[PDB]
Amino acid sequence: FCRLRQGELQVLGGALLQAPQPVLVKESELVKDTLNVLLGVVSATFSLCQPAQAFTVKRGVHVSGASPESVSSLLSEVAECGTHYARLSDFSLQPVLDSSCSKGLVF
């Protein structure tokens, strides 16, 4: 039903989803990708794309009995969280990473 509603909206708008067309994501697959970003990693829907540096969504994951709009919207909120996690882990490596640091013991 929701995929049909999304498809009707797409037909009205000219099939302007491409990626937002449901990325058929098993709730298990979504949980796995969540466990991926749980390490602050760049999952498939959390990939650190070139213009992302951090969580970048997959092809519009749908929900259990829904289209991708709200499913991937909540996924995108969680993706903002996991993108912050990936970047934050990189920032958490700032002391070790900046071994040749001209900033003293502060960093």
Partner: protein, 103 residues
């Protein structure tokens, strides 16, 4: 190579010790220790990762890394010889899962 450089360094140290010792004898280790690469302690210097299960491939890589960190080239990731003064260069199988291989 690293072995050649180590041998040259030992020879140079021996030469300096002979030039400075005025005939003072120094211990000479059996060359088999430095001439036995199988006796080196560094990292030794896999199922198709697209076919094995990600968990099974991860377990095989875990055994591989236990071996490599214990001085034995692993199945998927193996740290290989160093050219001169360097660490053992780890070459990982490229078909593994992205995050798994990254970690």
């Amino acid at each position: 190579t690293w072995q050649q450089s180590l041998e040259l360094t030992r020879k140079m140290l021996r030469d300096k010790q002979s030039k400075k010792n005025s005939g003072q004898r120094l211990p000479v280790l059996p060359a088999w220790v430095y001439e036995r690469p199988a006796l080196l302690g560094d990292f030794l210097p896999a199922v198709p990762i697209g076919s094995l299960p990600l968990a099974s491939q991860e377990a095989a890589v875990v055994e591989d890394l236990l071996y490599v960190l214990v001085g034995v080239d692993g199945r998927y990731i193996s740290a290989q010889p160093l050219t001169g003064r360097q660490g053992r260069t780890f070459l990982v199988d490229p078909n593994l899962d992205l995050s798994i291989r990254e970690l």
